[PDB]
Amino acid sequence: LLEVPFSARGDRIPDAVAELRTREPIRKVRTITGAEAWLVSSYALCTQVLEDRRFSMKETAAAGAPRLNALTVPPEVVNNMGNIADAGLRKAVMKAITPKAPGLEQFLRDTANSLLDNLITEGAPADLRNDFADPLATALHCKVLGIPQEDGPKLFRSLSIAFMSSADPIPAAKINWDRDIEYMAGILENPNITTGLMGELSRLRKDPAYSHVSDELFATIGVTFFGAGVISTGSFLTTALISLIQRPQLRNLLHEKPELIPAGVEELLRINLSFADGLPRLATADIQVGDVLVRKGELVLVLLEGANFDPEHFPNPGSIELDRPNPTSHLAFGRGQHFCPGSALGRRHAQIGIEALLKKMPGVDLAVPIDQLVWRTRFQRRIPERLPVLW
Numbered sequence: 001l002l003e004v005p006f007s008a009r010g011d012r013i014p015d016a017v018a019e020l021r022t023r024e025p026i027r028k029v030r031t032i033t034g035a036e037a038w039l040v041s042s043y044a045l046c047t048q049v050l051e052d053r054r055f056s057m058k059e060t061a062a063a064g065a066p067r068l069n070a071l072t073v074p075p076e077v078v079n080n081m082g083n084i085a086d087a088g089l090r091k092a093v094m095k096a097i098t099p100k101a102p103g104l105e106q107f108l109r110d111t112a113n114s115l116l117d118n119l120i121t122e123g124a125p126a127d128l129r130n131d132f133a134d135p136l137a138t139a140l141h142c143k144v145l146g147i148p149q150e151d152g153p154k155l156f157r158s159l160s161i162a163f164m165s166s167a168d169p170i171p172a173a174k175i176n177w178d179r180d181i182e183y184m185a186g187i188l189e190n191p192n193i194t195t196g197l198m199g200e201l202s203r204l205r206k207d208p209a210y211s212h213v214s215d216e217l218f219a220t221i222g223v224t225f226f227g228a229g230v231i232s233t234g235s236f237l238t239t240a241l242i243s244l245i246q247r248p249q250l251r252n253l254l255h256e257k258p259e260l261i262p263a264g265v266e267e268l269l270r271i272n273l274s275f276a277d278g279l280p281r282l283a284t285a286d287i288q289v290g291d292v293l294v295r296k297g298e299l300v301l302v303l304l305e306g307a308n309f310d311p312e313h314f315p316n317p318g319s320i321e322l323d324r325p326n327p328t329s330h331l332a333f334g335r336g337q338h339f340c341p342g343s344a345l346g347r348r349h350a351q352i353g354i355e356a357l358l359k360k361m362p363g364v365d366l367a368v369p370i371d372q373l374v375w376r377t378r379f380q381r382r383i384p385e386r387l388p389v390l391w
């Protein structure tokens, strides 16, 4: 039986996705746990699944369900956004993580420019993942959360394990989870934390209108938004920079006309292979999806690059076109109930990171042949361990 995932490489889509989309856009596969699942790979069917709440994210955590991979968080946390909504906290969380907070965009620029200055001073080769994209992501999310910049690196080092995609439970994941929860609980008791997401959560925690919300949920919001945000933005920016380096004509165009960078980033989002696995959902009813009657209790995997390279929806899908008529209709941030709450911040992180890099390193290029990149395996993202460049 066809095993997923197909390839950990984030620099090229396997030829098999297109043939699967054409012939079997919903197809039975085996996951790394040994469970069976339905892999959905066309734009039409991917959108159907994500927009039908009966395909439940929450129920993927039920005991005895077929699993894509092992949980790395407590089962209740799989429903974290539903818990946030039920607590009446959605508006406050969204307001705290907008890229339009005063001084945040300028903080992003100053930080990106400082990171790039340090690389230039040290001399090529430079590692654009470990010494640019991930530190930029980490610094951004410390500022967004309102926590000390010096705490970022230790929090960041949990993520190589927290976002593993493993057949079995991971002992280190619980060690790091409990420790990072204790950190965020301490932050909520820290009177000097008055800004960002944790500053706001700290205030709502003492507000009688939120008296019933548990201290547990408040800390969980901090841990999960730091982790999801840092791993997602660092990983997306890293693999977007590869796609840009691989396209010197686009690199030069965006350097010459940086007003096109937002449109470029939107296409880089569309063609991005950062998510290593399909998005998992558990059917809570018998539901027809294409030629398959998905049965209650079965696992469905929504393959984002299946949708995003679907030639029916995105003609010439492998080509970056800055003037498509449906440019944000990609699924890089998902779709439906669980659409990424950090999408605006993720866009701005990448836009500013690319703007700064192209200004400082207009001649940026890989310093090793592309096949020498080492792609992380059994992880929820596809990323190179190091991204060596010259300029």
Ligand code: HEM
Binding pocket: 057, 078, 080, 081, 082, 097, 224, 225, 226, 228, 229, 230, 232, 233, 236, 279, 280, 331, 332, 333, 334, 335, 337, 338, 339, 340, 341, 342, 343, 345, 346, 347
């Ligand atoms: C380019 C950057 C990003 C990408 C590509 C991305 C991608 C995604 C996708 C595809 C989903 C849907 C998962 C699903 O439906 O199963 C998602 C959800 C989520 N994202 Fe992002 N994300 C990014 C940035 C961020 C940031 C900056 C934050 C927070 C600061 C964040 C926090 C979350 C959270 C908490 C969820 C869970 C939503 C839910 O369970 O309803 N992400 N993200």
Ligand SMILES: FC(F)(F)c1ccc(-c2ccc(Cn3ccnc3)cc2)cc1
Binding pocket: 057, 060, 061, 062, 067, 068, 069, 070, 071, 073, 077, 078, 079, 080, 081, 224, 228, 280
């Ligand atoms: F909202 C957040 F906190 F961000 C959040 C959102 C979703 C998850 C999630 C974790 C795993 C799986 C799949 N899976 C594997 C084994 N069992 C279920 C699906 C969803 C976790 C946290």
Ligand SMILES: FC(F)(F)c1ccc(-c2ccc(Cn3ccnc3)cc2)cc1
Binding pocket: 072, 073, 155, 158, 159, 162, 163, 173, 176, 177, 180, 181, 223, 224, 225, 226, 227, 228, 232
């Ligand atoms: F170990 C910590 F650092 F504490 C840690 C552990 C796990 C998470 C986590 C947050 C969300 C999701 C689901 N998810 C992925 C992309 N979008 C949603 C999975 C994992 C965050 C932090």
